Design a protein around this ligand. Structure first.
Ligand SMILES: CSc1ccccc1CC(=O)N1CCC[C@](O)(C(N)=O)C1
Ligand SMILES: [Zn+2]
Length: 139
């Protein structure tokens, strides 16, 4: 669990979206595992607008933050699950680090702000869904 709260938006993993998120849907992309819904109260998270490949992520399965080097956003094969058949997820960034299924939603940050949220993992690797390109989150 976990979300990005910026302005009047709530950014979450699409496979963990609630009924309220679908009733207040702004945008969703299955290929990116992202869903953005609207909120009545303001959000104060700052989105990083950058090309950083180092940062820190929150890992709820360990209750610890971890520094990571991560790849550039791209198309990576993600194995079939109860939410998706086997497919390439786009805008995904990989790093060496611990993750477990309940870790989706943990924020990845750099000095510039929020980079994305935990989306995939397995075998000593953790995958992050990038949000830096979603310029409309600020506007
Ligand atoms: C941090 S998730 C994780 C971590 C360690 C081991 C296994 C996982 C599960 C995992 O990767 N997914 C299952 C749910 C759907 C998924 O989020 C997607 N975007 O397709 C992928
Ligand atoms: Zn940055």
């Amino acid at each position: 669990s976990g979300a990005i709260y910026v302005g009047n938006y709530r950014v979450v993993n699409r496979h963990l979206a609630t009924h309220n998120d679908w009733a207040n849907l702004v945008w969703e992309d299955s290929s990116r595992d992202l869903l953005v819904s609207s909120t009545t109260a303001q959000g104060c998270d700052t989105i990083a607008r950058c090309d950083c490949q180092t940062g820190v992520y929150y890992c709820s399965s360990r209750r610890k933050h971890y520094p990571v080097s991560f790849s550039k956003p791209s198309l990576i094969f993600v194995e079939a699950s109860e939410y998706y058949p086997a497919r390439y997820q786009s805008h995904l960034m990989l790093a060496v680090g611990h993750s477990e299924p309940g870790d989706c939603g943990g924020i990845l940050r750099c000095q510039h702000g929020v980079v994305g949220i935990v989306s995939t993992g397995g075998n000593g690797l953790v995958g992050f869904a990038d949000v830096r390109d979603l310029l409309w989150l600020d506007e």
